[PDB]
Amino acid sequence: PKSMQCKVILLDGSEYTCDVEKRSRGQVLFDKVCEHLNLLEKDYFGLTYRDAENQKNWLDPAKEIKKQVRSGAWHFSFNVKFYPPDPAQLSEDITRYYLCLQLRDDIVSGRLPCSFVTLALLGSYTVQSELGDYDPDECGSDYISEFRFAPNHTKELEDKVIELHKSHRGMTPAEAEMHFLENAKKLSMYGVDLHHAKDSEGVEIMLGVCASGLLIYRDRLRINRFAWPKVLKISYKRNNFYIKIRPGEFEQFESTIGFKLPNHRAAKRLWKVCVEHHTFFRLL
Ligand SMILES: Cc1ccc(CS(N)(=O)=O)cc1F
């Protein structure tokens, strides 16, 4: 049996290395990573890899790893795939912990936009979880945390994290993580996967995929929302992605909305994440 070495970037930034038989399906590697992480609520999560364009792709657990990575390195990341709309309802604290680590990267990266006060509040719960009770000894008027909290760090943000951290005395890591999630879950881009596209007139839009449905972000005043029940059918053809929407009270037949993606691969990727999130929705 010939085995391929796999390297997985974990959500704490560390690297897990293991071997799988070269013809292994994704699920084999994923099971090894989740056992390493002591994770039981596995189906919220998945592995990604980067292709030659350095675009992220979900490793399909049902398909051979080699038919997905193809010419690329067997290098993966462990990530949240399905963001729980209600993290309080997860059965295990360790699940909420990994979701916190993913969200911290969502924030620092700018994928999850956040007001100054939300950045500071989330940062304060992370510090409480990571270091425990506020200690003046390792925090002078000039203090700067090791923790990355935001896409752009300022002294004013560091000071506000410390002010809020003082208020959390006696909070355990599980409690601070639950508070972090109660706040993060409310953010307008929580669990939203954004895809670049053009509408049928060639105007640049963003399509967002999430547990509740599909968003068409046209401009700040114009954001079309289609809850999953309103979506009859999804499809891709060449560089085009189509959604069929149930007729409204003033409609006789369904409507079709068409979108132009950059390339055939970007259309197929969008279709697959839509199908997957639609199934997640049907499980809620
Ligand atoms: C798709 C999907 C199914 C089930 C669960 C719950 S679990 N098995 O992780 O505890 C999460 C999911 F995201």
Side-chain angles (χ1 to χ4, degrees), residues 39-45 81-84 90-91 95 276 279-280 283:
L39 174 62
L40 289 192
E41 294 180 281
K42 291 150 52 150
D43 297 296
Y44 296 105
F45 300 89
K81 187 167 185 187
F82 303 108
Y83 288 71
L90 295 170
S91 72
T95 315
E276 285 166 335
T279 304
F280 183 61
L283 270 322

Side-chain angles (χ1 to χ4, degrees), residues 148-164:
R148 300 162 48 256
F149 303 124
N152 288 283
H153 297 294
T154 66
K155 186 52 165 47
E156 53 265 31
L157 177 60
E158 298 288 327
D159 291 345
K160 194 61 182 193
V161 167
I162 287 148
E163 175 195 294
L164 290 176

